[PDB]
């Protein structure tokens, strides 16, 4: 019939570039946010293709009763859905909310199905998210315990104002309020913002708190516990759904920096012991877990799909004949390819303001090199036949790289889209041939755009979805919600398609959760909550299976003289000197800390250092002197270490010698005395670990060299096209006591207008901090918006471009996004992407030159791991239990059971749910159940324990978990019984805490049994010693960057990022910076006031107490601060990973 017909029709390629078609039609038209009624055409027409793609299907591969074929097929079934619901909508419609629709968009993912071997992708990426699997309940189980633990610590800790003082002025029955006005009642005062503190510079509230630790109270203002909330009402760390969300985010390090610059400042600095636990295992170590479980699926399907696969003469000849003769010549070849060196040299130094004949003499330059060029390709050209020349890889992109260059220059009067000077730029990547690093950077790309070209699309695929899902839902809601006060919407809201797209982009960056914030304050918490963690799943599964693709994809690919120098030999050879020398290092590297702001006023103690200082010098000159001839110079020299010890010994004699004889203070000896912040690394080469660690590290010193060489000639593409691009558009001018908002545009239009108008003294033209103007200033700003942190003002300064020197207008050059989105694809990831793939090389090959595989080890741990795994390897044979009486004899026929014991294992997660359900201020009805319940598991554990500890004498004290058993019932009887005691006591907000704490020791107990954590837990506690030793170093590093910041950055401005408690005045306040800007969190906005100079944003001149006058940070050393600080903690933080791969591959390939 027509079945044998239809069946003609299906197979067709038209057919299926048809369908593709009508789906990416539709994929245009439903990207739109407003319709027009022009829509009658279109989406009948649609629904119609729609129709007549599933007939044929129908008509072919159906009768009645298919459960065979097109029905077992699950991709069909959406096919349906979207026919079915089209059918069904289309008649009369039953809820009239029109969020209908968006059901249509099911439209735009039926495309999987339809290209290629796409369905092969999704089929992988739903295996990895199977095989993940145990990583998953251990991620939760620790969220929940941590956030067990940030209640039992900071419960309702976090809702403290800092309220204006009141009286209660004994007047009226109730609680009147004075402020100087009456308040009706205590609590109706404390809920309106009128008593509250704005925070300096911000719009926050100030927090306080009753400790000795935490901020304080200005001279009028009180610190108590009453108010809505922080942020928005959604950071509370009260009421457990809130401390789960709250410690999530702090696992995923999204703006946790404002987390706990709020939570220490109210409950007291102390606690920043909780942040470097949660940070060091559940943030570190849970993030970099997922990636190896991630990463050893992705390589084991890999594996296992490369094994399935594998099972007119004259003239033209004599001219041809030299001019080939030139051109294979190796040594004009050189003057070429250095030549064009010289040209991206030359176009890194086109600055901001030109001097208006350098400009010509720049234009010069690049005509003359256009023309060498030119004249190599015709050379090549008449060289050999032009079939022959367009051959390979390189010719033809150095002819499209002339033409376009050539083409461009010769429209001399053109209007100018300012790309044309990029058109010359693009020439960088030609010397790639030469260099052995730049290759492998063009191999990624071409490795991720059509090799691996799919996984690419269906990321464009997923992001496109998400973005249309969230426009098509939280599109109306953002309308007339959003402020304005101009008619002025947000900067990342989602009404457009492009917005709606870039604020997905956010969550794949990793930043969501300011988004959500703006979200749920028009569009409620359930379904924000929902999209944006979907978002954040699916989307960094997709783009992390992405990165790890290329990863793999590209790596994959006198007889006196003798004794004495024998004695003294033998006088460093004995224990006790080098033990006083460690003890005097120590002593000598931590009495420094005491140089702070507060050594004025502390006189007494002031000249005890300087004893203290002149008396380590002689010390140390003594060991070097008395190393000398114990070594001899041959021995000593060629060391490595004593050159440190040397150099260090060198510098105190020259600040010794200066300051002694030759009373000089007088000038530079300051800024040398300066660098004796270097004496912590003489404890650098004893400590035997951290020795190995500065060997591994300097082992993999010259391949750092080269990648950061790659990374800086590719960033100079960017930093040349945004001095191309935004040089000189970056001037704002600024109202002066508002602080920091740009003027309106429609009163001042130029720099003209701004510097024409003082005639008050008010407006001053202030650049941004971070522009781009010179070429250097610009390769700042691409570490900023690289690292992602301080982009947003960029990117905001960029956006509201206008002109070259005149005011910025909120949306005037909206479409320059795209160029940061290209930097953060290109740049950013595949930075990332060959910085890792080469450390993780160098480290592999330097592990197969060693003996003992393993690095980062000391000799004494590498023989404590061979006792260590001989603990749970391969399941131990055991010993079976026997009765003894005829009393105890039949309990444990009762105990031993495995009913008994899921029994206890069922009840205990009851017992962490009555642990859950605690709240902040919630009745006095509920406290006293809570705690009768208390006691009563207590009392079934206690009764189970002793029962199970006359069951068995000996056989009780075997498992080594049975002891924690009893040590966490003990724990628990102390938590009880103690509780009563603390009335008699001084102030317990806090001590009743650390007391209730052990609970958790109950929690601890699920653990027996569940060997997807039992495995991947011991996998980490036969990871502790390579973790602490890495350890060392990182604090020994965050000191000594401590003692030079302390040294250098006391005494700044204090706004955007220093505040009065983070902030470099003593060695407890900087401790605290060094370590969020470990995790790099939050570094912009410590260099923003250290970037300053004179007025506005600082003051010179300032009265200072220190000897020292100005109060303006230098940014030539605030930079290289930073700058180096964070290279040095992002390479340890990578070692870290490499630490927990290593174990997590040893455990799984072990078992
Ligand atoms: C959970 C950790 C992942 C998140 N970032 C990318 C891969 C890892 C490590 C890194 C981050 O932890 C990090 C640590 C230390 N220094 C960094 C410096 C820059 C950076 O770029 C966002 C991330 C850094
Ligand atoms: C309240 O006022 C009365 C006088 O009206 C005075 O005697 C009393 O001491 C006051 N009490 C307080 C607590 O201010
Ligand atoms: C307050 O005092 C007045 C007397 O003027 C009385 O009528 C009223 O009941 C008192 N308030 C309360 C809550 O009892
Ligand atoms: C505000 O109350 C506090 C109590 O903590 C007190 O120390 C302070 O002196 C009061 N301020 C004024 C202006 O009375
Ligand atoms: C601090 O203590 C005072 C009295 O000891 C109390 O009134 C106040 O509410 C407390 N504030 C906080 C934040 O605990
Ligand atoms: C700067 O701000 C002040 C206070 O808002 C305002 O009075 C002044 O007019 C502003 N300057 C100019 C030039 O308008
Ligand atoms: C600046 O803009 C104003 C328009 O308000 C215009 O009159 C003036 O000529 C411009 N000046 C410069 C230097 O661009
Ligand atoms: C505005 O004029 C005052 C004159 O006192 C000056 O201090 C300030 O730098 C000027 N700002 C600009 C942008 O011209
Ligand atoms: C600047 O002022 C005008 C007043 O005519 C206002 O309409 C405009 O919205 C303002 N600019 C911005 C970016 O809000
Ligand atoms: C906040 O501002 C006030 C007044 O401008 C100042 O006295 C104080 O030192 C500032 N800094 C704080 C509270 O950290």
């Given at each position: 019939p027509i079945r044998r017909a239809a069946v003609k029709i299906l197979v067709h390629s038209l057919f299926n570039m048809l369908i593709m078609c009508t789906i990416l039609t539709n994929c245009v038209f439903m990207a739109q946010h407003d319709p027009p009624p022009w829509t009658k055409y279109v989406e009948y027409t649609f629904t119609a293709i729609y129709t007549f793609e599933s007939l044929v299907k129908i008509l072919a591969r159906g009768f009645c009763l298919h459960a065979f074929t097109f029905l077992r097929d699950p991709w069909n079934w959406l096919d349906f859905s979207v026919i079915i619901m089209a059918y069904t909508t289309?008649?009369?419609?039953?809820?009239?909310?029109?969020?209908?629709?968006?059901?249509?968009?099911?439209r735009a993912l039926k495309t999987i199905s339809v290209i290629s071997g796409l369905k092969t992708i999704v089929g992988a990426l739903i295996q990895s998210v199977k095989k993940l699997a145990d990583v998953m309940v251990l991620t939760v189980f620790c969220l929940s315990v941590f956030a067990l633990i940030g209640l039992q610590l900071f419960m309702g800790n976090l809702r403290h104002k800092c309220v204006r003082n009141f009286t209660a002025l004994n007047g009226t029955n109730g609680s009147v309020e004075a402020d100087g006005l009456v308040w009706e009642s205590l609590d109706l005062y404390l809920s309106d913002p009128e008593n509250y503190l704005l925070k300096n510079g911000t719009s926050d509230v100030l927090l306080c708190g009753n400790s000795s630790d935490a901020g304080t109270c200005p001279e009028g203002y009180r610190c108590l516990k009453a108010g809505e909330n922080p942020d928005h009402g959604y950071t509370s760390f009260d009421s457990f759904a809130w401390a789960f969300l709250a410690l999530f985010r702090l696992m995923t390090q999204d703006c946790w920096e404002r987390l706990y610059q709020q939570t220490l400042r109210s409950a007291?600095?102390?606690?920043?012991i909780f942040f470097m636990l949660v940070i060091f295992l559940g943030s570190f170590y849970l993030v970099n877990l997922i990636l190896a479980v991630v990463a050893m699926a992705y390589e084991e399907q890999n594996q296992a799909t490369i094994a399935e696969t594998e099972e007119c003469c004259p003239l033209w000849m004599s001219i041809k004949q030299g001019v080939k003769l030139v051109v294979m010549d190796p040594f004009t070849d050189l003057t070429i390819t250095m030549c064009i060196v010289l040209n991206t040299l030359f176009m890194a130094?086109?600055?901001?303001?030109?001097?208006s004949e350098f400009e010509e003499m720049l234009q010069v330059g690049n005509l003359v090199f256009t023309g060498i060029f030119t004249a190599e390709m015709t050379f090549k050209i008449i060289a050999l036949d032009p079939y022959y020349y367009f051959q390979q890889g390189w010719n033809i992109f150095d002819s499209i790289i002339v033409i376009l260059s050539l083409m461009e220059l010769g429209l001399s009067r053109m209007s100018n889209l300012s790309v044309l000077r990029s058109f010359r730029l693009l020439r960088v990547f030609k010397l790639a041939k030469s260099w052995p690093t730049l290759n492998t950077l063009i191999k990624i790309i071409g490795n991720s755009v059509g090799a691996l070209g799919n996984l690419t699309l269906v990321l464009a695929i997923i992001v496109f979805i998400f973005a249309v899902v969230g426009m098509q839902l939280f599109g109306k809601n953002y309308s007339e919600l959003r402020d304005s006060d101009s008619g002025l919407l947000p900067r990342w809201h989602m009404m457009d398609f492009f917005h709606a797209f870039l604020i997905i982009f956010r969550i794949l960056c990793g930043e969501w959760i300011e988004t959500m914030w703006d979200c749920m304050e028009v569009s409620g918490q359930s379904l924000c909550l929902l999209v944006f963690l979907l978002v954040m799943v699916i989307g960094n599964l997709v783009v992390l299976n992405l990165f790890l693709a290329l990863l793999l994809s590209s790596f994959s690919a006198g007889k006196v003289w003798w004794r004495l120098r024998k004695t003294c030999y033998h006088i460093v050879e004995h224990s006790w000197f080098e033990t006083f020398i460690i003890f005097m290092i120590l002593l000598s590297s931590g009495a420094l800390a005491f140089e702070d702001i507060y050594l004025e006023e502390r006189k007494t103690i002031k000249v005890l250092l300087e004893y203290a200082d002149k008396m380590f010098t002689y010390v140390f000159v003594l060991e070097m002197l008395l190393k000398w001839v114990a070594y001899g110079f041959k021995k000593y020299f060629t060391n490595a270490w004593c050159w440190l010890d040397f150099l260090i010994v060198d510098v105190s004699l020259v600040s010794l010698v200066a300051n002694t004889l030759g009373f000089a203070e007088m000038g530079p000896i300051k800024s040398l005395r300066t660098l004796?912040?270097?004496?912590?690394?003489?404890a650098l080469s004893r400590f035997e670990g951290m020795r190995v660690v500065v060997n591994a590290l300097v082992g993999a010193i010259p391949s750092i060299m080269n990648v950061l060489l790659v990374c800086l000639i590719f960033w100079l593409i960017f930093s040349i096209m945004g001095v191309n691009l935004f040089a000189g558009k970056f001037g704002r001018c600024i109202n002066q006591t508002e602080g920091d908002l740009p003027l309106n545009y429609?009163?001042?239009?130029?720099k003209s207008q701004c510097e024409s108008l003082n005639l008050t003294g008010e407006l001053y033209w202030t650049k941004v901090k971070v522009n781009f103007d010179n070429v250097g200033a610009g390769y700042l700003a691409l570490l900023q918006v690289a690292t992602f942190k301080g982009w947003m003002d960029i990117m905001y300064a960029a956006v509201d471009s206008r002109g070259y020197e005149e005011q910025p207008q909120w949306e005037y050059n909206l479409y320059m996004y795209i160029y940061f989105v290209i930097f953060i694809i290109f740049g950013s990831f595949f930075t990332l992407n060959l910085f890792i793939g080469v450390i993780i090389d160098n480290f592999n090959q330097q592990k197969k030159k060693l003996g003992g595989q393993d690095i980062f080890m000391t000799e004494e741990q590498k023989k404590y791991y061979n006792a260590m795994k001989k603990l749970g390897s391969k399941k131990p044979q055991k010993p079976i239990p026997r009765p003894l009486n005829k009393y105890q004899g039949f309990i444990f026929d009762i105990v031993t059971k495995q009913a008994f014991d899921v029994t206890i294992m069922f009840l205990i997660c009851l017992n962490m749910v009555t642990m859950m359900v605690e709240t902040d201020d919630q009745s006095p009805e509920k406290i006293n159940i809570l705690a009768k319940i208390n006691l009563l598991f207590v009392a079934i554990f206690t009764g189970e324990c002793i029962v199970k500890l006359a069951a068995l004498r000996h056989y009780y004290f075997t498992n080594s978990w049975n002891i924690f058993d009893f040590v966490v019932v003990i724990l628990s009887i102390v938590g009880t019984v103690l509780s009563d005691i603390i009335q008699k006591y001084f102030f317990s907000p806090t001590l009743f805490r650390v007391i209730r704490?052990?609970?958790?020791?109950?929690?601890?107990?699920?653990?027996?049994?569940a060997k997807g954590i039992r495995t991947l837990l011991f996998a980490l506690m036969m990871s502790l010693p390579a973790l602490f030793n890495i350890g060392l170093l990182l604090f020994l590093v965050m000191f000594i960057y401590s003692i030079f910041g302390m040294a250098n950055f006391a005494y700044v401005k204090w706004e955007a990022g220093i505040d009065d408690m983070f902030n470099f005045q003593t060695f407890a306040n900087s401790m605290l910076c060094l370590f969020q800007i470990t995790t790099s969190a939050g570094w912009d906005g410590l260099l923003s006031p250290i970037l300053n100079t004179g007025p506005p944003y600082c003051d010179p001149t300032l009265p200072n107490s220190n000897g020292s006058r100005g109060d303006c940070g230098s940014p030539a050393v605030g930079i290289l601060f930073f700058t180096t600080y964070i290279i040095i903690s992002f390479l340890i933080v990578v070692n870290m990973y490499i630490a927990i791969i290593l174990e997590n591959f040893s455990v799984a390939t072990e078992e």
């Amino acid at each position: 019939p027509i079945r044998r017909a239809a069946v003609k029709i299906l197979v067709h390629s038209l057919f299926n570039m048809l369908i593709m078609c009508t789906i990416l039609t539709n994929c245009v038209f439903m990207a739109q946010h407003d319709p027009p009624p022009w829509t009658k055409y279109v989406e009948y027409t649609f629904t119609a293709i729609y129709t007549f793609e599933s007939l044929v299907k129908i008509l072919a591969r159906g009768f009645c009763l298919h459960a065979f074929t097109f029905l077992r097929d699950p991709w069909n079934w959406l096919d349906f859905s979207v026919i079915i619901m089209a059918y069904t909508t289309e008649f009369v419609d039953l809820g009239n909310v029109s969020a209908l629709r968006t059901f249509r968009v099911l439209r735009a993912l039926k495309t999987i199905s339809v290209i290629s071997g796409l369905k092969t992708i999704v089929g992988a990426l739903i295996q990895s998210v199977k095989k993940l699997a145990d990583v998953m309940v251990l991620t939760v189980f620790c969220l929940s315990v941590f956030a067990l633990i940030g209640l039992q610590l900071f419960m309702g800790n976090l809702r403290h104002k800092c309220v204006r003082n009141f009286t209660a002025l004994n007047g009226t029955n109730g609680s009147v309020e004075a402020d100087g006005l009456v308040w009706e009642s205590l609590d109706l005062y404390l809920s309106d913002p009128e008593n509250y503190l704005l925070k300096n510079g911000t719009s926050d509230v100030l927090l306080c708190g009753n400790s000795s630790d935490a901020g304080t109270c200005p001279e009028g203002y009180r610190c108590l516990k009453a108010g809505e909330n922080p942020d928005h009402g959604y950071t509370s760390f009260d009421s457990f759904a809130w401390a789960f969300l709250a410690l999530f985010r702090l696992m995923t390090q999204d703006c946790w920096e404002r987390l706990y610059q709020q939570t220490l400042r109210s409950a007291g600095k102390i606690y920043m012991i909780f942040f470097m636990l949660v940070i060091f295992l559940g943030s570190f170590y849970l993030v970099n877990l997922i990636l190896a479980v991630v990463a050893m699926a992705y390589e084991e399907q890999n594996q296992a799909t490369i094994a399935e696969t594998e099972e007119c003469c004259p003239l033209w000849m004599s001219i041809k004949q030299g001019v080939k003769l030139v051109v294979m010549d190796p040594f004009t070849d050189l003057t070429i390819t250095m030549c064009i060196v010289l040209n991206t040299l030359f176009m890194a130094l086109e600055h901001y303001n030109m001097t208006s004949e350098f400009e010509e003499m720049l234009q010069v330059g690049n005509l003359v090199f256009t023309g060498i060029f030119t004249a190599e390709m015709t050379f090549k050209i008449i060289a050999l036949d032009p079939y022959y020349y367009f051959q390979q890889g390189w010719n033809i992109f150095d002819s499209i790289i002339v033409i376009l260059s050539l083409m461009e220059l010769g429209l001399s009067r053109m209007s100018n889209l300012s790309v044309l000077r990029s058109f010359r730029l693009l020439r960088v990547f030609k010397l790639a041939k030469s260099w052995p690093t730049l290759n492998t950077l063009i191999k990624i790309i071409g490795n991720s755009v059509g090799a691996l070209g799919n996984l690419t699309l269906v990321l464009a695929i997923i992001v496109f979805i998400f973005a249309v899902v969230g426009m098509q839902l939280f599109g109306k809601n953002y309308s007339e919600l959003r402020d304005s006060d101009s008619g002025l919407l947000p900067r990342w809201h989602m009404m457009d398609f492009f917005h709606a797209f870039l604020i997905i982009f956010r969550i794949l960056c990793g930043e969501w959760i300011e988004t959500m914030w703006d979200c749920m304050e028009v569009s409620g918490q359930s379904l924000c909550l929902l999209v944006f963690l979907l978002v954040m799943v699916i989307g960094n599964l997709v783009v992390l299976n992405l990165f790890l693709a290329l990863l793999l994809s590209s790596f994959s690919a006198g007889k006196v003289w003798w004794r004495l120098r024998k004695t003294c030999y033998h006088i460093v050879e004995h224990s006790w000197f080098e033990t006083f020398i460690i003890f005097m290092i120590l002593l000598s590297s931590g009495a420094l800390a005491f140089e702070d702001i507060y050594l004025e006023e502390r006189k007494t103690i002031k000249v005890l250092l300087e004893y203290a200082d002149k008396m380590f010098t002689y010390v140390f000159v003594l060991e070097m002197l008395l190393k000398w001839v114990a070594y001899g110079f041959k021995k000593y020299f060629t060391n490595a270490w004593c050159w440190l010890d040397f150099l260090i010994v060198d510098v105190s004699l020259v600040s010794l010698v200066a300051n002694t004889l030759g009373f000089a203070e007088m000038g530079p000896i300051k800024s040398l005395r300066t660098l004796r912040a270097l004496r912590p690394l003489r404890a650098l080469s004893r400590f035997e670990g951290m020795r190995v660690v500065v060997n591994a590290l300097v082992g993999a010193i010259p391949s750092i060299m080269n990648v950061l060489l790659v990374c800086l000639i590719f960033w100079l593409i960017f930093s040349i096209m945004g001095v191309n691009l935004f040089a000189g558009k970056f001037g704002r001018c600024i109202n002066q006591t508002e602080g920091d908002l740009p003027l309106n545009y429609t009163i001042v239009n130029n720099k003209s207008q701004c510097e024409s108008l003082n005639l008050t003294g008010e407006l001053y033209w202030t650049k941004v901090k971070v522009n781009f103007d010179n070429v250097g200033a610009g390769y700042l700003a691409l570490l900023q918006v690289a690292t992602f942190k301080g982009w947003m003002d960029i990117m905001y300064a960029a956006v509201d471009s206008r002109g070259y020197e005149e005011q910025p207008q909120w949306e005037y050059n909206l479409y320059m996004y795209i160029y940061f989105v290209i930097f953060i694809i290109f740049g950013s990831f595949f930075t990332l992407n060959l910085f890792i793939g080469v450390i993780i090389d160098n480290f592999n090959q330097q592990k197969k030159k060693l003996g003992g595989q393993d690095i980062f080890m000391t000799e004494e741990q590498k023989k404590y791991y061979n006792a260590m795994k001989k603990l749970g390897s391969k399941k131990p044979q055991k010993p079976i239990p026997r009765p003894l009486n005829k009393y105890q004899g039949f309990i444990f026929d009762i105990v031993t059971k495995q009913a008994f014991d899921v029994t206890i294992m069922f009840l205990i997660c009851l017992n962490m749910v009555t642990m859950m359900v605690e709240t902040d201020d919630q009745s006095p009805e509920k406290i006293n159940i809570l705690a009768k319940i208390n006691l009563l598991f207590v009392a079934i554990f206690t009764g189970e324990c002793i029962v199970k500890l006359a069951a068995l004498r000996h056989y009780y004290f075997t498992n080594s978990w049975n002891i924690f058993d009893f040590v966490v019932v003990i724990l628990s009887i102390v938590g009880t019984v103690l509780s009563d005691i603390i009335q008699k006591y001084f102030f317990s907000p806090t001590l009743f805490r650390v007391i209730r704490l052990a609970r958790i020791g109950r929690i601890l107990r699920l653990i027996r049994g569940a060997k997807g954590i039992r495995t991947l837990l011991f996998a980490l506690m036969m990871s502790l010693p390579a973790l602490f030793n890495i350890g060392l170093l990182l604090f020994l590093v965050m000191f000594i960057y401590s003692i030079f910041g302390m040294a250098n950055f006391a005494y700044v401005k204090w706004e955007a990022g220093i505040d009065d408690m983070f902030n470099f005045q003593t060695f407890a306040n900087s401790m605290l910076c060094l370590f969020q800007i470990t995790t790099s969190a939050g570094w912009d906005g410590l260099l923003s006031p250290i970037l300053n100079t004179g007025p506005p944003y600082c003051d010179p001149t300032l009265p200072n107490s220190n000897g020292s006058r100005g109060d303006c940070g230098s940014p030539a050393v605030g930079i290289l601060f930073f700058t180096t600080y964070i290279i040095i903690s992002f390479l340890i933080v990578v070692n870290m990973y490499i630490a927990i791969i290593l174990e997590n591959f040893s455990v799984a390939t072990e078992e």
